[PDB]
Amino acid sequence: DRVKKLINSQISLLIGKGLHEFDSLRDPEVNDFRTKMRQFCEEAAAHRQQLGWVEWLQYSFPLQLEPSARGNRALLVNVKFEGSEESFTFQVSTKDMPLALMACALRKKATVFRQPLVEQPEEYALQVNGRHEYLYGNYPLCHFQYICSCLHSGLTPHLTMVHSSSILAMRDEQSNPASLWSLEQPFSIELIEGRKVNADERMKLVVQAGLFHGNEMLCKTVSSSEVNVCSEPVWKQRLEFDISVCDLPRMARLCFALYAVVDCPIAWANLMLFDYKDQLKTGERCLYMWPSVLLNPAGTVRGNPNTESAAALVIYLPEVAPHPVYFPALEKILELGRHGERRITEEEQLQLREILERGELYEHEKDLVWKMRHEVQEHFPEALARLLLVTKWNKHEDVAQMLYLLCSWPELPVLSALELLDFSFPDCYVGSFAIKSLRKLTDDELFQYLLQLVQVLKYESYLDCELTKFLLGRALANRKIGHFLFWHLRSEMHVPSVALRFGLIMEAYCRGSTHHMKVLMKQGEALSKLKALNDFVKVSSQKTTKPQTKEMMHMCMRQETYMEALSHLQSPLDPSTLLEEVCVEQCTFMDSKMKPLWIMYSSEEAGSAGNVGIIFKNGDDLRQDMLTLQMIQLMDVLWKQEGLDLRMTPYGCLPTGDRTGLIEVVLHSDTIANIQLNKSNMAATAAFNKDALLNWLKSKNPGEALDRAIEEFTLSCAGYCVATYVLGIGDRHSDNIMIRESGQLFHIDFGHFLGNRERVPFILTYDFVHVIQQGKTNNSEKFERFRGYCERAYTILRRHGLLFLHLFALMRAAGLPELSCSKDIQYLKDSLALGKTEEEALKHFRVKFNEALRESWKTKVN
Numbered sequence: 129d130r131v132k133k134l135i136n137s138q139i140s141l142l143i144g145k146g147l148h149e150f151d152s153l154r155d156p157e158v159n160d161f162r163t164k165m166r167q168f169c170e171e172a173a174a175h176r177q178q179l180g181w182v183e184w185l186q187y188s189f190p191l192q193l194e195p196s197a198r199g200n201r202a203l204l205v206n207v208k209f210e211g212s213e214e215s216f217t218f219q220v221s222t223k224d225m226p227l228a229l230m231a232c233a234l235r236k237k238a239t240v241f242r243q244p245l246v247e248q249p250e251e252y253a254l255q256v257n258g259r260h261e262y263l264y265g266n267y268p269l270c271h272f273q274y275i276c277s278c279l280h281s282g283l284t285p286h287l288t289m290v291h292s293s294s295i296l297a298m299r300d301e302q303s304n305p306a307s308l309w310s311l312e313q314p315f316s317i318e319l320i321e322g323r324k325v326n327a328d329e330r331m332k333l334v335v336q337a338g339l340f341h342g343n344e345m346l347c348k349t350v351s352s353s354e355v356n357v358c359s360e361p362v363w364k365q366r367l368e369f370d371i372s373v374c375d376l377p378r379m380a381r382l383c384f385a386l387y388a389v390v391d392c393p394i395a396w397a398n399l400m401l402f403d404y405k406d407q408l409k410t411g412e413r414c415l416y417m418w419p420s421v422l423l424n425p426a427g428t429v430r431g432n433p434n435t436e437s438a439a440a441l442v443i444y445l446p447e448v449a450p451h452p453v454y455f456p457a458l459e460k461i462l463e464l465g466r467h468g469e470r471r472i473t474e475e476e477q478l479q480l481r482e483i484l485e486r487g488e489l490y491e492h493e494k495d496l497v498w499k500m501r502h503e504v505q506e507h508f509p510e511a512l513a514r515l516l517l518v519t520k521w522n523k524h525e526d527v528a529q530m531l532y533l534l535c536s537w538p539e540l541p542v543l544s545a546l547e548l549l550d551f552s553f554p555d556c557y558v559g560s561f562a563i564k565s566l567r568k569l570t571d572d573e574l575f576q577y578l579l580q581l582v583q584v585l586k587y588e589s590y591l592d593c594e595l596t597k598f599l600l601g602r603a604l605a606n607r608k609i610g611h612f613l614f615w616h617l618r619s620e621m622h623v624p625s626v627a628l629r630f631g632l633i634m635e636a637y638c639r640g641s642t643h644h645m646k647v648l649m650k651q652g653e654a655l656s657k658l659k660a661l662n663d664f665v666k667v668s669s670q671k672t673t674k675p676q677t678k679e680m681m682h683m684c685m686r687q688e689t690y691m692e693a694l695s696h697l698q699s700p701l702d703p704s705t706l707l708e709e710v711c712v713e714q715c716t717f718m719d720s721k722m723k724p725l726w727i728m729y730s731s732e733e734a735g736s737a738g739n740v741g742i743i744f745k746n747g748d749d750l751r752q753d754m755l756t757l758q759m760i761q762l763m764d765v766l767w768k769q770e771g772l773d774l775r776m777t778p779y780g781c782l783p784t785g786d787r788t789g790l791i792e793v794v795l796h797s798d799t800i801a802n803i804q805l806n807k808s809n810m811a812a813t814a815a816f817n818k819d820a821l822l823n824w825l826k827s828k829n830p831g832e833a834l835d836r837a838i839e840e841f842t843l844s845c846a847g848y849c850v851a852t853y854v855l856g857i858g859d860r861h862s863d864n865i866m867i868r869e870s871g872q873l874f875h876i877d878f879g880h881f882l883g884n885r886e887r888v889p890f891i892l893t894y895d896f897v898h899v900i901q902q903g904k905t906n907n908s909e910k911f912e913r914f915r916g917y918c919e920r921a922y923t924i925l926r927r928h929g930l931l932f933l934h935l936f937a938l939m940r941a942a943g944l945p946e947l948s949c950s951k952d953i954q955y956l957k958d959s960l961a962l963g964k965t966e967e968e969a970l971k972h973f974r975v976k977f978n979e980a981l982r983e984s985w986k987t988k989v990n
């Protein structure tokens with residue numbers, strides 16, 4: 129009673145939408161979703177509460193492994209036991225496993241405490257000090273991201289021996305508190321009227337209507353008659369479509385576009401012809417229209433919630449029978465589809481093989497794919513998508529024949545399944561099949577594609593769907609998946625077209641983890657304070673000097689309400705990172721229009737690794753930055769899987785609200801512009817501005833360390849030259865390029881990509897060529913190694929070209945202005961030269977790299 133009511137108010141506050149608002153809709157689809165998903169998520173919670181202690185570590189602290197390890201050398205490690213000040217430093221091999229390190233620490237504890245211990249190494253796990261990260265399992269130490277990170281930066285790993293009883297105490301502490309196919313007549317509707325229409329009185333109003341199965345028309349579009357512009361237009365007319373009622377596929381959507389003609393677009397509205405319970409819709413429909421920015425088939429099938437101001441179209445769906453009509457059950461479909469004809473010549477089998485291994489077709493090529501559909505299934509199962517695209521979705525007999533093959537189709541690789549999630553495959557059985565083949569995604573692969581899977585929810589026609597159930601089950605089985613699923617949904621609650629769907633998924637998730645709900649509430653409280661703090665800084669920076677606004681920001685942060693809200697939270701950018709003590713004196717803000725905040729933290733428990741920063745931004749939109757950075761990270765994983773480490777810096781970036789988000793601070797780094805300012809009385813001051821970068825590296829890396837820094841610069845420079853070229857990152861200048869004290873170069877500010885439109889050429893800067901060449905004018909040995917790194921990076925990306933294409937195609941659902949159409953996708957197709965052979969693509973890259981070298985030399989002339 130009192131706990132339920134409190135939890136309900138806590139979910140309302142967390143998701144940014146009162147749960148009573150779901151109840152007020154009196155929507156049976158909303159009610160069934162809420163009841164079935166609450167049950168599903170509570171069942172997941174009960175399974176979790178009884179997990180074994182090692183399984184609970186897999187849930188709460190999933191392993192962070194090196195990409196090359198997924199599916200020798202000496203090392204110094206500092207190990208302590210929980211709640212003990214005392215620690216032990218000892219030598220291990222990078223090939224040693226956590227258990228050997230643990231047995232070693234237990235022998236030391238037994239010698240110091242003078243007693244032969246009862247404890248076996250099997251009863252413990254290794255925590256990374258002051259982090260929600262653990263080392264466990266039969267993996268050598270160098271396979272762990274944390275150990276790998278220490279090895280490269282020279283730092284000593286600091287670990288804590290945590291007993292099973294302590295992990296079990298965590299699990300316990302975090303518990304949830306106790307017949308259609310006979311109807312041959314053409315499809316028709318009555319277009320009754322319009323309400324709250326706003327247009328120029330000199331013009332006339334028209335309603336264009338179309339039937340779609342995804343993006344493809346099921347028949348030609350039909351238009352109403354022209355009627356004089358007014359607030360309440362009255363048509364009362366029959367719109368007849370060239371398709372029989374029996375031929376409407378299950379996922380058929382009726383799409384409307386209201387406009388004014390002398391073309392002046394006004395509004396659009398879509399609806400599914402069948403409901404969530406498979407019933408063919410009849411009766412009057414009031415469609416609350418969305419404003420046009422003509423027909424929008426990809427647009428949401430739910431009405432505009434702003435019923436007070438929105439244009440409304442009133443339609444009538446006729447009663448096609450005196451009894452309700454449902455879409456036929458799978459048994460009936462399989463029965464009709466089971467019947468057909470299966471041959472073809474040795475020459476035409478070569479023609480089919482040619483086009484299936486080849487991707488638009490000519491009409492005759494389509495007919496052969498369809499005729500040879502059984503052979504597509506048995507000998508080319510990976511060509512399923514091609515066959516689905518040749519299926520006549522406007523003929524129920526062909527759809528039955530297609531569904532018959534699909535229902536016995538072998539499971540496809542993850543790559544093939546991602547393509548099938550596109551809106552180009554709108555059928556529900558196709559969608560279910562795609563999810564079935566995605567079930568084999570590892571948590572690491574799932575995390576890599578989570579952003580695209582969340583965007584795909586915007587294409588879904590109904591609330592209760594296989595994709596939502598899949599995402600929820602995986603989120604509830606892995607705390608990190610759960611964390612990012614929550615933030616990707618929460619960051620879009622200000623978007624009315626997704627607020628209901630996203631709000632309902634977050635509620636179900638919360639029912640599955642009351643403890644995680646409170647952990648996320650703590651994060652939301654810090655974000656609420658940062659927004660109030662940022663508003664103060666925006667106002668104050670216009671009235672006074674920078675030192676004054678900064679002192680005022682500090683005084684504001686030092687208030688008890690701010691010190692409480694801003695400290696002791698898991699970072700929204702990374703739940704493994706603990707943001708412990710806010711270091712007010714180190715906090716500041718940037719001089720740009722939105723005055724973003726620079727927030728520093730420290731943790732005595734984590735030591736040096738506890739010194740972390742976040743950038744809070746309110747006013748800018750970080751969605752494209754997050755996507756670009758996720759793509760750069762993916763490049764890093766694919767390169768590392770080929771044994772290529774280009775020493776990349778894919779720092780965290782996460783939208784959290786309406787034009788609000790965080791960016792991970794990379795410490796010990798500066799922009800190229802700041803370094804090239806060549807200030808006097810500094811360790812880097814230069815005789816020639818071209819020496820500035822190398823002198824800065826020299827001051828940071830004395831003696832023998834310079835060699836390693838130049839190499840880190842070269843590797844990262846090759847990675848970023850390739851990444852920015854492939855992704856078409858433009859507006860590159862000295863203040864959006866950074867260098868770490870390690871020598872690593874990295875890019876920032878990804879507000880423009882995919883050419884935005886101009887084809888971005890490969891960029892080679894003389895300043896960077898100068899450092900790669902160790903400061904020498906001529907150094908082809910070092911320069912050409914760098915070219916090899918670029919070529920190797922580029923050829924790896926090309927081999928995974930389809931993965932980038934499939935992911936970017938799914939991202940079109942995000943509604944990013946620079947990722948809206950096929951033209952934007954064509955940019956990636958050209959940058960990766962996907963229509964060519966590897967030798968032709970490498971020849972093309974070489975011409976592009978040489979064109980960038982001749983461009984660079986115009987600066988070398990001076």
Ligand SMILES: COc1ncc(N2CCOc3ccc(CN(C)C)cc32)cc1NS(C)(=O)=O
Pocket residue numbers: 718720724743753779791792793794795797799876877878
């Ligand atoms: C899209 O905006 C951003 N993208 C990335 C960063 N990074 C992330 C990595 O750590 C950094 C360390 C220093 C600087 C450069 N300094 C001048 C603040 C920038 C960054 C920062 C911003 N936004 S800002 C700070 O420029 O207002």
